[PDB]
Amino acid sequence: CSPGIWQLDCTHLEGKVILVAVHVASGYIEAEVIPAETGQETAYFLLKLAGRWPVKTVHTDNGSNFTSTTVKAACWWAGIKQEFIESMNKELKKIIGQVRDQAEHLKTAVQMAVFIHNKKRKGYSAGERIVDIIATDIQ
Amino acid sequence: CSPGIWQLDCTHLEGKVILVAVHVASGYIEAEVIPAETGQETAYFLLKLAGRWPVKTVHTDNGSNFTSTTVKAACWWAGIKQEFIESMNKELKKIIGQVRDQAEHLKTAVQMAVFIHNKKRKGYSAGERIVDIIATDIQ
Ligand SMILES: Cc1nc(NC(=O)NC2CCCCC2)c(C)c([C@H](OC(C)(C)C)C(=O)O)c1-c1ccc2c(c1C)CCCO2
Ligand SMILES: Cc1nc(NC(=O)NC2CCCCC2)c(C)c([C@H](OC(C)(C)C)C(=O)O)c1-c1ccc2c(c1C)CCCO2
């Protein structure tokens, strides 16, 4: 429940890679579809995320993801430390499946799924919860 | 100062296109580097943004950006309406210039610049302000 904790993983769909970030306290996510499951992709993603949110620690279900020099450079620069129960990859995958017919590209469907999950209330939505948590923590 | 208002534009650097989003009330931004300045890129960006934040209206300095069918589809689905003094593209560009030497790719420098701007206090930072504004508006 610490507010600066995020979880990062890659799932595979349609021979494509989806990078999924979860803010643990709230259940909010960001995701992107990447061409390849490399360290460079992760590092860049981390950079984007850190600029957006106050990211203090990151946990992953695959430790080897975080061994690249590039990833380390990103965590060093942005001041992120590594951390050593979702499972929203299933839920996200579920939502992607429902809307997949709607879009040509997998990435579009993924973004649609992110939108639905973050928005849905079950009574704040995750999108509401993350702002509430972060703002409160600020003062 | 309405909390759901965002501003979207493209600047050019190094023969590359940067899409920049500003949350007007706070000065917070998100940016991406895109290959080409197309409607499809914008639509996809909008989707990502809308999932992340509560986006009610979007203004741009180039109205023709928003004429593509693809963009319209994105605004329709996410419930965004069009809206008809930054100028942070200069400031962002300024920051990109300072750090450009640090990275090989322009995109990395851009993300670095986003991070610096959102973080900097001058006394909340923009990153703080956007959460404060959105959370407050929620209750
Ligand atoms: C509306 C839309 N179109 C395309 N591609 C097209 O060829 N569209 C032409 C537009 C002129 C008239 C004939 C059809 C695509 C590719 C998309 C989506 O792709 C992007 C990258 C643009 C998001 C897609 O993957 O389906 C869309 C589109 C755009 C936004 C959007 C949705 C779609 C289908 C679905 C709902 C969420 O918002
Ligand atoms: C550290 C880093 N490296 C590369 N590329 C490499 O070839 N790195 C190898 C790593 C093994 C030992 C020799 C050097 C790149 C391209 C980057 C940046 O690119 C990505 C896409 C990975 C972000 C870059 O554009 O410079 C970096 C890198 C990664 C993170 C990072 C920074 C850099 C330079 C700069 C500070 C912010 O965080």
UniProtKB/Swiss-Prot annotation, chains A, B:
Domain statement: The core domain contains the D-x(n)-D-x(35)-E motif, named for the phylogenetically conserved glutamic acid and aspartic acid residues and the invariant 35 amino acid spacing between the second and third acidic residues. Each acidic residue of the D,D(35)E motif is independently essential for the 3'-processing and strand transfer activities of purified integrase protein.
Binding site for Mg(2+) 3: 9, 61, 86
Location of the protein in the cell: Virion; Host nucleus; Host cytoplasm
Residue ranges of every copy of the Integrase catalytic domain listed in the record: 1-134
Tree of life domain: Viruses
Function, as annotated: Catalyzes viral DNA integration into the host chromosome, by performing a series of DNA cutting and joining reactions. This enzyme activity takes place after virion entry into a cell and reverse transcription of the RNA genome in dsDNA. The first step in the integration process is 3' processing. This step requires a complex comprising the viral genome, matrix protein, Vpr and integrase. This complex is called the pre-integration complex (PIC). The integrase protein removes 2 nucleotides from each 3' end of the viral DNA, leaving recessed CA OH's at the 3' ends.
Quaternary structure and interacting proteins, as annotated: Homotetramer; may further associate as a homohexadecamer. Part of the pre-integration complex (PIC) which is composed of viral genome, matrix protein, Vpr and integrase. Interacts with human SMARCB1/INI1 and human PSIP1/LEDGF isoform 1. Interacts with human KPNA3; this interaction might play a role in nuclear import of the pre-integration complex. Interacts with human NUP153; this interaction might play a role in nuclear import of the pre-integration complex.
Residues of the full protein shown: 1203 to 1356 of 1435
Protein name: Integrase
